[PDB]
Amino acid sequence: VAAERLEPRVEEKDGYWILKEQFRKGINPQEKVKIEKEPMKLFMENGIEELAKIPIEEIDQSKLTKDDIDVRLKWLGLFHRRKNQYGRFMMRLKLPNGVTTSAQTRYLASVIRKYGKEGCADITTRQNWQIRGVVLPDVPEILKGLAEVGLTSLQSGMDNVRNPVGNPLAGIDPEEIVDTRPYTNLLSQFITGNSRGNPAVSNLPRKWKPCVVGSHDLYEHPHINDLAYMPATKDGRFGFNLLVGGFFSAKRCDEAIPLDAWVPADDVVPVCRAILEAFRDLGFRGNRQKCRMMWLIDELGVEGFRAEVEKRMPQQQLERASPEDLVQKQWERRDYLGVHPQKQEGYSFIGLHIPVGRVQADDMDELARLADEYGSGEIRLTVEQNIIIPNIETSKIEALLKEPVLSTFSPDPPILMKGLVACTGNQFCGQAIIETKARSLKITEEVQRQVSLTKPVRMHWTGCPNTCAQVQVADIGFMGCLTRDKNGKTVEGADVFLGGRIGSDSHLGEVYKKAVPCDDLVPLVVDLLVNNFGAVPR
Ligand code: SRM
Ligand code: SF4
Ligand SMILES: O=S([O-])[O-]
Numbered sequence: 001v002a003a004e005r006l007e008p009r010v011e012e013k014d015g016y017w018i019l020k021e022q023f024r025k026g027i028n029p030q031e032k033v034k035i036e037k038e039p040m041k042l043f044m045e046n047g048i049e050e051l052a053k054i055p056i057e058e059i060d061q062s063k064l065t066k067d068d069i070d071v072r073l074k075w076l077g078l079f080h081r082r083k084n085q086y087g088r089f090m091m092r093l094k095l096p097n098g099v100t101t102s103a104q105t106r107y108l109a110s111v112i113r114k115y116g117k118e119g120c121a122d123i124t125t126r127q128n129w130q131i132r133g134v135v136l137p138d139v140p141e142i143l144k145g146l147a148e149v150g151l152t153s154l155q156s157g158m159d160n161v162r163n164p165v166g167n168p169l170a171g172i173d174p175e176e177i178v179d180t181r182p183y184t185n186l187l188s189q190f191i192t193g194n195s196r197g198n199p200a201v202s203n204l205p206r207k208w209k210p211c212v213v214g215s216h217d218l219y220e221h222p223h224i225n226d227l228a229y230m231p232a233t234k235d236g237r238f239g240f241n242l243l244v245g246g247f248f249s250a251k252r253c254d255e256a257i258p259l260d261a262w263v264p265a266d267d268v269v270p271v272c273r274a275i276l277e278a279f280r281d282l283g284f285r286g287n288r289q290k291c292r293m294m295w296l297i298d299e300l301g302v303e304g305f306r307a308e309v310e311k312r313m314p315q316q317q318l319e320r321a322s323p324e325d326l327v328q329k330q331w332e333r334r335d336y337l338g339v340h341p342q343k344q345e346g347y348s349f350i351g352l353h354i355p356v357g358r359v360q361a362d363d364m365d366e367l368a369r370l371a372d373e374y375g376s377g378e379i380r381l382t383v384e385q386n387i388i389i390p391n392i393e394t395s396k397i398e399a400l401l402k403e404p405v406l407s408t409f410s411p412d413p414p415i416l417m418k419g420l421v422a423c424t425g426n427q428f429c430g431q432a433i434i435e436t437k438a439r440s441l442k443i444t445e446e447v448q449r450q451v452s453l454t455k456p457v458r459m460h461w462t463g464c465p466n467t468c469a470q471v472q473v474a475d476i477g478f479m480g481c482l483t484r485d486k487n488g489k490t491v492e493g494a495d496v497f498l499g500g501r502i503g504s505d506s507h508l509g510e511v512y513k514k515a516v517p518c519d520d521l522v523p524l525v526v527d528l529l530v531n532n533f534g535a536v537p538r
């Protein structure tokens with residue numbers, strides 16, 4: 001490994017970090033777009049204000065502005081639905097640990113309410129909000145409204161640090177290991193430069209996903225994140241062992257491996273910076289299928305890569321890993337849906353199921369209102385695209401169970417619905433091969449009408465190989481494809497995955513059966529359930 005491989009490939013030129021002209025050969029077109037103009041200048045040099053003034057039809061007539069809206073705007077959290085909702089933008093937040101407020105929730109609703117049939121919102125597999133319908137001339141004013149309610153959307157798409165995921169039961173669970181809200185909160189601020197923008201970590205070769213583990217249940221999915229913080233004592237000090245490189249991609253899925261490093265709790269942020277700088281400095285920037293952090297780790301080796309993190313640390317010490325973490329391997333992951341006692345006596349939380357994560361403006365207002373009336377104005381999102389409303393005086397529960405909105409967003413849905421996860425699909429996503437959200441609900445419904453079960457089978461539905469709905473963690477996973485019916489007609493279909501496990505004994509699922517027409521999945525899934533999961537025919 002020639003020591004010239006270890007040379008930083010980016011420079012801080014003019015407050016922004018850019019590829020050095022010697023390392024700019026044979027790069028992918030997303031590296032070029034970033035070279036041509038720095039994406040952070042759209043927020044940090046307020047250049048959205050004037051881009052927002054150009055008709056969409058004009059913007060498309062020159063490469064430079066077409067890349068503004070189709071590419072660079074993703075650093076502002078805005079994603080052009082070019083194919084399926086032309087001239088409309090999806091918008092994704094920073095919502096560390098998935099904690100929102102009623103007033104944030106109400107503001108998001110008032111933005112999507114405006115767009116009518118073209119608007120709705122969604123809870124994501126990184127316990128985040130997305131809103132849809134957004135038009136460009138509205139961006140400057142939405143940005144201002146987001147800030148006003150204490151939210152940022154910065155650096156949530158493209159080559160950025162994505163939503164910091166944490167324990168959905170942080171601060172409320174008797175059985176928590178460590179409260180992850182400070183650490184995800186700190187990480188988000190670091191990333192976004194306390195909502196101003198942070199160009200030091202805004203030009204990675206590829207997306208990068210952190211989590212901070214606080215549950216024995218491992219609700220955080222540490223195994224599939226580029227950096228996972230595993231609570232662990234070392235030499236009497238509380239800290240985190242570090243796992244690195246977990247990712248999913250059309251080409252390759254790989255679980256996170258130990259860096260062989262521990263940090264004390266106060267080093268969470270500087271080790272995040274060190275790894276990211278290493279990644280940004282040294283990361284490969286050709287073929288996009290070969291750009292995530294694991295590919296660098298495989299080229300340098302784990303000790304190669306580790307030495308590079310160590311030299312970007314303060315004091316340049318990176319302690320070796322504590323041989324055990326605080327996570328109990330004896331643990332049955334817990335159903336958070338329903339009413340549960342909090343550690344603060346007299347109080348309860350409620351997990352409410354949100355069918356495939358999909359909400360309309362009216363829905364968001366109802367949940368905002370339950371949080372205000374029954375809780376403390378707080379709503380928490382989950383990675384299965386559900387909600388928790390914490391801090392409810394247990395004496396209010398009886399009245400809450402009677403609220404009409406709880407027939408739609410239930411604390412006790414049938415067990416297959418409890419764990420159903422589906423990505424956007426082709427209603428809005430231009431990469432999608434199939435419609436996922438409506439389809440998955442319809443299939444799950446007909447399957448559950450047929451069988452009854454005790455084990456909580458988790459079914460994930462994803463619209464294309466990008467696997468945003470993470471079919472490799474599911475008990476039964478469905479990946480969109482096109483296939484053929486008995487007459488050779490093109491029909492939507494799914495590859496069915498099995499074998500995915502979560503919690504400490506985590507495992508990646510693989511395709512069990514390819515190209516099953518979607519209209520044939522009910523009998524197949526019914527049988528799989530009966531034969532493999534203890535389901536009983538009704
Ligand atoms: C919304 C969400 C799925 C959802 O219904 O929940 C989704 C959204 C899409 N992802 Fe994802 N990703 C989401 C979960 C993830 C995850 C799960 C996770 O993070 O744990 C995965 C797999 C895990 C991983 O990345 O390590 C993921 C895999 C990707 C990939 C494949 C990555 C790769 O290295 O090849 C793409 C395509 C790409 O990056 O080139 C992508 C790109 C896309 C885009 C941005 C593509 C596009 O612009 O059309 C999707 C936007 C569709 C839309 O309009 O909503 N999305 N995506 C999730 C939003 C997360 C967030 O709030 O930040
Ligand atoms: S898995 Fe594919 S279809 Fe689904 S949201 Fe991600 S990119 Fe779109
Ligand atoms: O956009 S995806 O990477 O969450």
Ligand SMILES: [Cl-]
Nearest residue numbers: 074157158159
């Ligand atoms: Cl993106």
Ligand SMILES: [Cl-]
Nearest residue numbers: 081082083430
């Ligand atoms: Cl598109």
Ligand SMILES: [K+]
Nearest residue numbers: 354357384385
């Ligand atoms: K859900």
